[PDB]
Amino acid sequence: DFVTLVSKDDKEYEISRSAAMISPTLKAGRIELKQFDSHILEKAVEYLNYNLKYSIPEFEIPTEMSLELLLAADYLSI
Amino acid sequence: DFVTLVSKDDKEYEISRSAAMISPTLKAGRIELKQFDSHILEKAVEYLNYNLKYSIPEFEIPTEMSLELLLAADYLSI
Amino acid sequence: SVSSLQSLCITKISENISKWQKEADESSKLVFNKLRDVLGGVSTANLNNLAKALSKNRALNDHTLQLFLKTDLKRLTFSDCSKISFDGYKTLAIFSPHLTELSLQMCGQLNHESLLYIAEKLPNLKSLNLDGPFLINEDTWEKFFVIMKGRLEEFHISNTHRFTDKSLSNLLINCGSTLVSLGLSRLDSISNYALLPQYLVNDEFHSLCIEYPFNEEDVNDEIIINLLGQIGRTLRKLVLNGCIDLTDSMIINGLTAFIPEKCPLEVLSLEESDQITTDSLSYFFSKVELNNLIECSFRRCLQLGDMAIIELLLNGARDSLRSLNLNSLKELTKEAFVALACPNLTYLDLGFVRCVDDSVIQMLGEQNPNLTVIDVFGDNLVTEKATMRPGLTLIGRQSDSI
Amino acid sequence: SVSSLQSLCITKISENISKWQKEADESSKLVFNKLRDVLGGVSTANLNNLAKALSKNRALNDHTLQLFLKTDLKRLTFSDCSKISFDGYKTLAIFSPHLTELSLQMCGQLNHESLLYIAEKLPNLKSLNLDGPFLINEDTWEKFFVIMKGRLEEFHISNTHRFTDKSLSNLLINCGSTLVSLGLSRLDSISNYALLPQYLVNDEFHSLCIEYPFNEEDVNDEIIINLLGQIGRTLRKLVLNGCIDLTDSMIINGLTAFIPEKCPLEVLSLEESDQITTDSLSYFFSKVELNNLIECSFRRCLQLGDMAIIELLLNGARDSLRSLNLNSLKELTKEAFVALACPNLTYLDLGFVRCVDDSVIQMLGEQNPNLTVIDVFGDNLVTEKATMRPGLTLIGRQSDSI
Ligand code: NA
Ligand code: NA
Numbered sequence: 001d002f003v004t005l006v007s008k009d010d011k012e013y014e015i016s017r018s019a020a021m022i023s024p025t026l027k028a029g030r031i032e033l034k035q036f037d038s039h040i041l042e043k044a045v046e047y048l049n050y051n052l053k054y055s056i057p058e059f060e061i062p063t064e065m066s067l068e069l070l071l072a073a074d075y076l077s078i
Numbered sequence: 079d080f081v082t083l084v085s086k087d088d089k090e091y092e093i094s095r096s097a098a099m100i101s102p103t104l105k106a107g108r109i110e111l112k113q114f115d116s117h118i119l120e121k122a123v124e125y126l127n128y129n130l131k132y133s134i135p136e137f138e139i140p141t142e143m144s145l146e147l148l149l150a151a152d153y154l155s156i
Numbered sequence: 157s158v159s160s161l162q163s164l165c166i167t168k169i170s171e172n173i174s175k176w177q178k179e180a181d182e183s184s185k186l187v188f189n190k191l192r193d194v195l196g197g198v199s200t201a202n203l204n205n206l207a208k209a210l211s212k213n214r215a216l217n218d219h220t221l222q223l224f225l226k227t228d229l230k231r232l233t234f235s236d237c238s239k240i241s242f243d244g245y246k247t248l249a250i251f252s253p254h255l256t257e258l259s260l261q262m263c264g265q266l267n268h269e270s271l272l273y274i275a276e277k278l279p280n281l282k283s284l285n286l287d288g289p290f291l292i293n294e295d296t297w298e299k300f301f302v303i304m305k306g307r308l309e310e311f312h313i314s315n316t317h318r319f320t321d322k323s324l325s326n327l328l329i330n331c332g333s334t335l336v337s338l339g340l341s342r343l344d345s346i347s348n349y350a351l352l353p354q355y356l357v358n359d360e361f362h363s364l365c366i367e368y369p370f371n372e373e374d375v376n377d378e379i380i381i382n383l384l385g386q387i388g389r390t391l392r393k394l395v396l397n398g399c400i401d402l403t404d405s406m407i408i409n410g411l412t413a414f415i416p417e418k419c420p421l422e423v424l425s426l427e428e429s430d431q432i433t434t435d436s437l438s439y440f441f442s443k444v445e446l447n448n449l450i451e452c453s454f455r456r457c458l459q460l461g462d463m464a465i466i467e468l469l470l471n472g473a474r475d476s477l478r479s480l481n482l483n484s485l486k487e488l489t490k491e492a493f494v495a496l497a498c499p500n501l502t503y504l505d506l507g508f509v510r511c512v513d514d515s516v517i518q519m520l521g522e523q524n525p526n527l528t529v530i531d532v533f534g535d536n537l538v539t540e541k542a543t544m545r546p547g548l549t550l551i552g553r554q555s556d557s558i
Numbered sequence: 559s560v561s562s563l564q565s566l567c568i569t570k571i572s573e574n575i576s577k578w579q580k581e582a583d584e585s586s587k588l589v590f591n592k593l594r595d596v597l598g599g600v601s602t603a604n605l606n607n608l609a610k611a612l613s614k615n616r617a618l619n620d621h622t623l624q625l626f627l628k629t630d631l632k633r634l635t636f637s638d639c640s641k642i643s644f645d646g647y648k649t650l651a652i653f654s655p656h657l658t659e660l661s662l663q664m665c666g667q668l669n670h671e672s673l674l675y676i677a678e679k680l681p682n683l684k685s686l687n688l689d690g691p692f693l694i695n696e697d698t699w700e701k702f703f704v705i706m707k708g709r710l711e712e713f714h715i716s717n718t719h720r721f722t723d724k725s726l727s728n729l730l731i732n733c734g735s736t737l738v739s740l741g742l743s744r745l746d747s748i749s750n751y752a753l754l755p756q757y758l759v760n761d762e763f764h765s766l767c768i769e770y771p772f773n774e775e776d777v778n779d780e781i782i783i784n785l786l787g788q789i790g791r792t793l794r795k796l797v798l799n800g801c802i803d804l805t806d807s808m809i810i811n812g813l814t815a816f817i818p819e820k821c822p823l824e825v826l827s828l829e830e831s832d833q834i835t836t837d838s839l840s841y842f843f844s845k846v847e848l849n850n851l852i853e854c855s856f857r858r859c860l861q862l863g864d865m866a867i868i869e870l871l872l873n874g875a876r877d878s879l880r881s882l883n884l885n886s887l888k889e890l891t892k893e894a895f896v897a898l899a900c901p902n903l904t905y906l907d908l909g910f911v912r913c914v915d916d917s918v919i920q921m922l923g924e925q926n927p928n929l930t931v932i933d934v935f936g937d938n939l940v941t942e943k944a945t946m947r948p949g950l951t952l953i954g955r956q957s958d959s960i
């Protein structure tokens with residue numbers, strides 16, 4: 001009961017279907033998220049799991065990826 | 079028919095009495111102008127002579143002494 | 157007769173401040189790059205995406221505005237400027253000299269000084285889109301258009317009753333022959349739409365937008381026909397929403413007469429025209445080829461039925477459409493959607509489309525590989541059993557109404 | 559119940575902009591030092607001298623203002639701000655956080671926003687002198703005094719009829735007990751001078767200035783006596799010009815009663831008081847020691863004669879005075895100037911002093927080694943033969959009247 005997720009790099013990531021359901025743009029299956037690096041998606045998945053759990057600690061966001069991560073959250077509507 | 083003028087340094091400068099008359103603050107004699115370097119007074123005298131002559135080329139003012147020279151012109155009211 | 161030594165020193169000082177300004181301007185460039193680089197960096201190609209994210213989160217303000225300063229960006233769009241102050245607009249103009257196109261949506265705080273900064277500090281500016289500049293009075297509009305005389309190629313203004321007929325005249329008098337794109341939307345004081353055919357003479361005019369005139373009879377068939385006789389040849393964007401006074405006459409004597417068969421239209425919208433018939437649009441679509449139509453909306457064209465949509469799809473639009481809005485077309489039947497098989501369609505608005513049921517959603521999902529969103533708000537015959545193959549999402553379900 | 563990832567990224571971004579602000583603020587410091595260094599450099603000790611030179615040449619404006627930005631200067635005086643815009647004042651406040659004393663003379667463009675920037679962005683500000691802020695209305699004054707509550711120790715305002723009695727009340731209510739220095743000059747709407755003795759209770763009050771009340775009876779003996787009963791002990795500056803309603807009563811029952819014999823007064827001015835007699839001032843000066851008096855003016859105290867001036871000089875002021883104004887004292891004779899032998903006197907205004915002739919100018923030039931300027935405007939008995947030993951210049955000659 002998982003959902004696969006691919007990055008710009010060939011690195012893949014699996015997410016609980018109930019966790020990926022938080023993103024209205026992730027109805028899958030399998031999704032290819034070009035234009036986003038591996039460190040970004042790893043943090044997006046980290047937030048999704050973090051969201052389903054407490055939906056409270058603070059979700060740490062590295063400064064060096066705040067802009068790019070904002071764009072990913074927008075596209076994912078999370 | 080001259081007027082002596084002293085700088086902060088012991089260097090002296092002579093000015094035509096008719097040229098120094100342009101400065102309302104120079105009624106001399108002999109004047110001691112502390113707080114002003116030698117390069118400043120040399121330019122002040124250069125302006126005084128320049129003034130009496132054409133009172134037309136432009137009076138060149140080095141950038142590196144524009145501020146300090148302004149203060150000297152103010153004190154001398156020239 | 158001789159300048160005082162004080163005056164001469166002041167001139168030298170003033171001259172060197174001016175030259176130092178440019179040096180300081182460069183030092184400013186580095187400091188703004190530092191902010192962007194510290195946050196991970198952002199190319200100019202993503203600056204508009206960043207602005208969009210901030211806008212949607214009501215997070216665009218004088219503080220975050222600094223992310224967009226001292227760049228070589230040329231086209232900037234701000235979707236919600238509500239929180240940007242008049243000083244914010246002035247600073248943007250000072251620190252974005254390379255701008256040629258600027259869109260300020262929801263710019264409630266833009267005032268006289270802000271508007272003249274934009275016109276006078278952005279020397280390459282040729283396109284300005286403003287939505288909600290309600291502070292600007294008619295006399296300020298005139299001053300802005302004088303300053304932009306001969307430079308303004310694109311002007312869209314919306315949502316202000318202080319943009320008067322006088323202001324429209326000063327726009328046309330000062331910039332008419334230069335305009336290739338014009339937008340007039342929700343301007344309660346505008347009634348002289350009849351002046352547009354006189355002044356919009358640029359042989360490259362391509363975008364006309366008119367929405368919700370205060371007195372609907374002020375946008376009549378005669379005016380739109382005469383306008384189409386001028387711009388129809390190069391028209392790539394035609395938007396006429398809420399112009400309820402228009403009839404088939406505009407379709408027969410205007411669009412069909414003056415739109416070339418090799419039609420360059422990329423965007424077409426005729427929302428709320430309850431007098432336009434299925435027959436007139438079928439007649440028009442069969443004549444022309446719409447191989448470049450990217451966006452099309454017939455929202456609340458209550459009379460339109462199957463043949464209008466079929467003729468549209470079969471005459472080129474099928475392969476180019478990316479979004480299509482059929483909202484409230486109660487006359488459509490299932491046959492219309494049989495032909496709706498588009499390789500590039502991604503968004504489809506079927507709100508209040510009576511005939512839509514699960515069988516239609518099923519068929520559409522299989523005939524449109526890139527379709528991702530279908531609005532079925534009001535389509536009671538769409539149940540939970542509506543098949544949604546991977547990637548397609550339905551909005552407007554009953555869960556959104558209870 | 560959980561913040562969106564978009565909101566969290568926006569918080570992180572916003573937080574890092576704030577920290578980056580301080581970095582950018584430092585980079586601004588270097589860029590402003592560059593401008594000053596490129597022009598030969600200027601220490602903070604000469605910044606006020608630079609401002610004076612620019613002011614006298616009407617050369618202080620938003621452009622040259624940049625010479626004074628991002629310094630550690632604490633006390634700044636601008637003698638003519640007429641050309642500084644409201645944005646200029648805002649930028650000064652942003653880039654001069656170390657200011658504690660600010661004097662803005664001829665600040666016609668200072669507006670509501672400019673005034674509140676000064677109060678809110680200069681956290682160390684304790685002294686403000688404004689001459690000509692005619693844009694500020696009474697309600698803005700109130701807001702400014704609320705913001706400065708408990709912080710404002712020195713306030714001088716001049717040349718505006720929009721500083722009303724209500725504004726004075728809000729100054730005293732909000733800052734009364736904090737004020738040690740107060741100036742009220744040419745305020746046409748002010749009449750409640752009687753409130754000053756109630757509110758000016760600070761045991762260190764040292765500077766009072768009142769000039770040209772609109773209705774002269776509003777500054778009467780009773781008010782000044784009561785005020786002196788409060789502040790006389792620590793008073794170092796007393797200026798009452800144009801208060802024509804004052805009489806010897808103020809001198810006998812106010813100054814003599816409440817000024818200590820070891821008088822700390824450094825500045826004393828009683829201009830245009832045509833009812834004060836030679837007797838009262840002689841009586842007062844013989845009682846006290848004025849060993850610290852630096853500046854003294856009796857301009858247009860038409861009654862004052864020799865003994866007032868003699869008692870002044872012989873009771874300490876002789877050795878401390880640097881400027882003395884006897885303009886229009888028609889009652890003086892040559893005997894008054896016999897005693898005028900001051901080691902530090904540099905400026906002497908003798909305009910319209912009937913008795914002055916060449917013999918007086920001669921004697922004064924020899925008895926005052928540091929005297930450099932003597933105004934003799936109106937003294938017809940001063941001829942070209944007036945001896946002027948090296949260093950002394952006479953202004954107000956006949957050549958200045960033809
Ligand atoms: Na700013
Ligand atoms: Na500026």
